[PDB]
Design a protein around this ligand. Structure first.
Ligand SMILES: Cc1cccn2c(=O)c3cc(C(=O)NCc4cccnc4)c(N)[n+](C[C@H]4CCCO4)c3nc12
Ligand SMILES: *[C@@H]1O[C@H](CO)[C@@H](O)[C@H](O)[C@H]1NC(C)=O
Ligand SMILES: *[C@@H]1O[C@H](CO)[C@@H](O)[C@H](O)[C@H]1NC(C)=O
Length: 536
């Protein structure tokens, strides 16, 4: 004669270890990290013999015990997220009885409550297997879910080992993040994101795109995590070994790095990163995109020769931080950084000193030339120098050799590929039918910006005969040219991308990475995988 079978009371069935306010605009009002969720359950007895023991089991394992054998309740902590079958069990001296199972969702930022990502193999992407052991990385931009319409589910995830999230901002007002002011709405949007947040703490630039914007599979208005971050959790469920790293900085967010002479602000930043990864568990480490140590970044007023020493100090403490984060969670975290490929920036830092803490170096072998100059035309990401200027120092090969001369192990170096074109208009005064020898009247009309074109657009317009295509065989670089108007764009295509893969294998380098994933029609990432030796 066991107790009567209990019946569970109607109540909340979704609980969050990490709470997310779906309508907040300040970061500290947006998320609240906790070590566990507080799950509650009620039940009704009908036989009314105050049984000696009640229990609450989730997937047949005990999470709580108490003596509520007369229509009672229970609260208890659940520290690991997921979908749980909840059952209430009552016992007397004769035996036990168990209520019907109801499902509860204990959400956490590792995606343990979500199904795998339903990703698209769209356009010209074709599937590969990561067999080479080489790094195949790409940047996913936070603002890509707006007119670009490139959510995380568009990322061809079997063709990557690393996905970099650009960007995670460091918070500060006038004097700390003035590079943002050259983009309308951005500086103020960062101020809104950090209303009441300590300066030099990490944050989220766009909380709407990151966590609140409805996306594929994450639209129900009580979904704890939506936006890019929620999809990234489902990405982790799809390919658990794909590394997802937050990219702190970029071109317009690197200014707060220069104030890290003050160790007080460096400890605050490093500590905020630890709390950031505990809060957002789907990230597998940290990518530091200080652009650049010593200066010559977006802001012409910061930079110092001392920055090289502090760049190593930052890597040291971040690594120690990740090591004690490993001691808590048992996971392996990665420390990477996107660094300049120009020698005048490399020499600012002794990378042989920083490399002991770093897993990979994301060598930005692009942006060598651009529409920021009407006179200095050239290849933006070529492998070698062109014959018309053999002593060109801003090449992939020259940068790699300069970095190797510092004593950097070849395995840590990951070569950059440009999924975009930088270009000019009105190129005139050129000789030898070489448009690079002339000058420009301004930037080329671009996809989302003056002087920047998506490769997808370059490829489409080439098929439609709108461009006169050329390949610099010596420098290993393609470029399109319209003679009637002076339009000239330099970029990476499948041929030059394959040549970068050969170069990485011939020199025992780490692999390839590309900016940005939403600017590719599939051809570039295809060539990255083929050029590195992966199986199709
Ligand atoms: C003025 C300028 C002069 C010299 C170099 N420059 C750059 O090397 C540069 C790079 C970037 C960039 O983001 N590269 C991708 C990227 C990927 C991963 C991590 N970090 C960065 C950039 N946005 N701008 C400024 C905007 C203004 C108009 C178009 O380029 C840049 N400007 C300049
Ligand atoms: C390029 O030339 C145009 C017109 O000659 C000028 O207005 C513009 O400021 C120039 N840009 C640079 C970066 O020199
Ligand atoms: C481009 O501008 C530079 C700057 O003075 C000048 O020296 C050079 O001759 C110009 N080239 C042409 C083809 O006009």
């Amino acid at each position: 004669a066991p107790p009567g079978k209990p019946s569970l009371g109607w109540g909340e069935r979704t609980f969050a270890i990490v709470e997310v306010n779906q309508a907040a605009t300040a970061y500290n009002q947006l998320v609240t990290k906790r070590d566990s969720a507080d799950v509650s359950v009620t039940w009704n007895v009908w036989s009314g013999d105050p049984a000696d023991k009640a229990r609450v089991l989730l997937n047949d394992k005990e999470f709580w015990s108490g003596t509520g054998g007369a229509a009672g309740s229970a609260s208890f902590k659940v520290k690991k997220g997921g979908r749980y079958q909840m059952v209430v069990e009552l016992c007397n001296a004769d035996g036990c009885s168990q209520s019907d199972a109801t499902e509860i969702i204990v959400a956490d930022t590792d995606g343990s409550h979500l199904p795998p990502l339903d990703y698209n193999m769209g356009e010209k992407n074709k599937p590969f297997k990561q067999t080479s052991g080489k790094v195949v990385g790409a940047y996913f931009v936070e603002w890509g879910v707006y007119p670009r319409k490139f959510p995380v589910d568009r990322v061809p995830i079997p063709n990557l080992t690393h996905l970099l999230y650009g960007f995670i901002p460091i918070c500060g007002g006038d004097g700390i993040n003035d590079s943002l002011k050259e983009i309308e709405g951005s500086f103020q949007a960062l101020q809104r994101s950090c209303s009441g947040r300590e300066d030099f703490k990490v944050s989220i630039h766009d909380p709407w795109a990151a966590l609140q914007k409805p996306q594929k599979g994450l639209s129900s208005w009580n979904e704890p995590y939506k936006g890019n971050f929620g999809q990234l959790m489902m990405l982790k469920q799809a390919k658990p070994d794909l590394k997802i790293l937050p990219s702190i900085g970029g071109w317009t967010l690197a200014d707060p790095f220069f104030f890290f002479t003050d160790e007080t602000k460096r400890r605050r930043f490093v500590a905020s990163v630890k709390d950031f990864l505990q809060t957002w568990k789907f990230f597998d480490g940290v990518d530091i995109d200080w652009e650049f140590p010593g200066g010559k970044g977006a802001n012409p007023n910061l930079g110092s020769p001392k920055d090289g020493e502090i760049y190593v100090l930052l890597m040291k403490e971040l690594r120690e931080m990740l090591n004690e984060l490993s001691a808590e969670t048992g996971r392996k975290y990665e420390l990477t950084s996107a660094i300049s490929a120009g020698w005048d920036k490399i020499q600012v830092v002794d990378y042989s000193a920083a490399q002991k803490y770093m897993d990979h170096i994301f060598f930005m072998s692009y942006d060598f030339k651009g529409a920021w100059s009407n006179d200095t035309l050239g290849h933006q990401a070529s492998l070698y120098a062109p014959d018309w200027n053999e002593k060109e120092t801003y090449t992939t090969d020259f940068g790699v050799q300069f970095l190797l001369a510092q004593g950097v192990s070849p395995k840590k170096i990951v070569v950059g590929v440009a999924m975009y074109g930088r270009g000019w208009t009105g190129v005139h005064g050129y000789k030898d039918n070489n448009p690079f020898t002339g000058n420009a009247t301004g930037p080329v009309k671009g996809t989302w910006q003056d002087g920047v074109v998506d490769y997808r657009e370059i490829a489409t317009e080439i098929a439609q005969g709108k461009w006169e295509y050329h390949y610099d065989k010596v420098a290993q670089a393609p470029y399109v040219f319209r003679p009637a108007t002076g339009d000239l764009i330099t970029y990476d295509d499948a041929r030059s991308t394959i040549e970068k893969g050969k170069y990485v294998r011939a020199n025992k380098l780490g692999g390839l990475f590309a900016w940005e994933i939403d600017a590719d029609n599939g051809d570039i990432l295809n060539a990255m995988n083929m050029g590195l030796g992966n199986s199709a």
